[PDB]
Amino acid sequence: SRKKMGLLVMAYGTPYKEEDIERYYTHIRRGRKPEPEMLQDLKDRYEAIGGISPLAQITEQQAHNLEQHLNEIQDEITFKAYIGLAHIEPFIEDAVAEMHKDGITEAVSIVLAPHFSTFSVQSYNKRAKEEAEKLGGLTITSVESWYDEPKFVTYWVDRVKETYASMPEDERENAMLIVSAHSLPEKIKEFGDPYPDQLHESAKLIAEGAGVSEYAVGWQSEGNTPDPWLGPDVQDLTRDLFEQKGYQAFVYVPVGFVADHLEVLYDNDYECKVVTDDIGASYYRPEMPNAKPEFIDALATVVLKKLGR
Ligand SMILES: [Mg+2]
Ligand SMILES: [Mg+2]
Ligand SMILES: [Mg+2]
Ligand SMILES: [Mg+2]
C-alpha cells in the first residue's frame, strides 16, 4: 500500500572529524591541497568555535528528524533519508548509490540552503541525477529553492521579533538587521542566477514580518578568486552602516545557512562580533534553525508541496 521513497538531503558538508579537514579543504579548492599553514589556520578556526565535532551532527539530526516527521504527518509515503554532501563523505554520489543499493526507485531531494544558485543547488541536483542515471532504475525530483516557504519565513520572523523585544529601548530604536547568505562570484549573474534576488526577497519578507525599521543585505564567507564576489561582506557592511548612522545594535540573520556551522559560528559570531565590539554596538544572532521542530515542519511542507501531496 504505502510506497517507499528516498529522501535525499543534500548540503555543502562539514567534516565529522578533524582528520578529514584536509581532504574537505582540497575538495573545496578543486584538487589543490592546502599548504600546511593554511590547513592549520582552518583547524584553528574550528577550534576557536569550540571544535568541529558538533557540526556534522546537526545535519544528521536534520535528516533524521525530517524523515521521522514526514512519516508521521502523512500515510501515503514512507520516506528514508539519505545525506549527500558536496565536499566530504558521504558524498552526494555515495548517497544516491546507497539509495539504489537499498532498492529505492523514486526519490525527492532537498538542499539545506533555501536559495537557489547555479553554483550550489543546481550543481548538487545535477550530481544527484547524474549518479542516478549511471545506476539506472532510480529517478530523483529535486527541490530548487524554498526560501519563500511561509513556515520558514515565520521561523526567522519570530526569532527576529524575539531578539528585538529582548533589547533595551535605546538599542531597539537604533538597531540594524543584516540579512546574509554565502557569497558567490558576481559572475553568476551573467548566467541569470537568481540567488541574489532571492536573498533580497528573504530579507524583505523577514524584516517586514518582524516589524524591523532598518535592514540591509550582505554576503559572507566569500572566497579568494580575483574576480568580484557578491558583496558587501557583512564585516564591511557593519562598519559602513555604523559609520553612517551609529547603530548601537546589529542583528545578524544568516538566512542562507540552516545550522550552527563554521560560516555562522565563526564568520558571524566571531568576525562580525569583532566589529560590533570594536564600534561599541551590541551583537545579536538569533538561533539557527538547526534540527528544531518548527524548521523540520517547514522542510516537510516544502517536500510535500514539491510532490503535490
Ligand atoms: Mg575515512
Ligand atoms: Mg561513484
Ligand atoms: Mg519556488
Ligand atoms: Mg572569510
CATH number, residue 271: 3.40.50.1400
Say if residue 95 is in the same domain as residue 172.
no
CB 308 within 8 A of CB 76: no
Residue 198 to residues 130, 273, 308, Cα–Cα distance (Å)? 26, 26, 23
> How many structural domains comprise the chain?
2
Dist. CA 6 → ligand 4 center (Å):
35
140 close to 82: Cβ distance less than 8 angstroms: no
Residue 42 sits in the same domain as residue 117: yes
Distance separating alpha carbons of residues 86 and 67, to the nearest angstrom: 20
CA separation for the pair 145, 115 (Å, rounded):
5
Is 216 in contact with 241 (CB distance < 8 Å)?
Answer: yes
Q: What cell does 244 get?
A: 553612517
What CA–CA distances, in Å, run from 270 to 117, 170, 249, 274, 277? 26, 24, 16, 6, 10
| 157: three-class secondary structure by DSSP | helix
Cα–Cα distance measured from residue 16 to residue 57, given in angstroms and rounded to the nearest whole number: 7
Cβ burial, residue 225 (10 Å; 0-12/13-18/19+): exposed
Q: Which residue type does 132 have?
A: A
Instruction: Check whether residue 63 and residue 163 sit in a common domain.
Output: no
- At residue 34, φ and ψ (nearest 5 deg) are -65, 145
Ligand 2 is a single-atom ion; what residues have CB below 5 A from it?
A: 93
Residues annotated as binding site for N-methylmesoporphyrin? 12, 30-32, 182, 187
Which grid coordinates are listed for 34?
A: 592546502
How far away, in angstroms, is 141 Cα from ligand 3 center? 14
Distance of alpha carbon 306 from alpha carbon 168, whole angstroms: 42
Strands (E), the chain: 3-11, 77-85, 106-111, 139-142, 175-182, 215-220, 249-253, 282-284
Ligand sitting nearest the alpha carbon of 22: 1
Strand partners, 6: 80, 107
Q: How many helices (H) and strands (E) does the chain have?
A: 12, 8
C-alpha cell at 186: 558576481
> Residue 86 and residue 50: Cα distance in Å, rounded?
24
Closest CA to 181 of 99, 120, 248, 97: 120
**Cell numbers of 19, please?**
582528520
Residue-range definition of the domain harbouring residue 187: 147-288
* Listed resolution, Å: 1.2
CA distances from residue 3 to 74, 90, 137, 140, 146 in whole angstroms, order as listed:
12, 25, 16, 15, 25
123 with 232, same domain: the answer is no
Do 83 and 109 sit in the same domain of this protein?
yes
Torsion over CA: 304, 3, 291, 180 (sign): negative
Residues 6+ positions from 126 with CB-CB distance below 8 Å: none
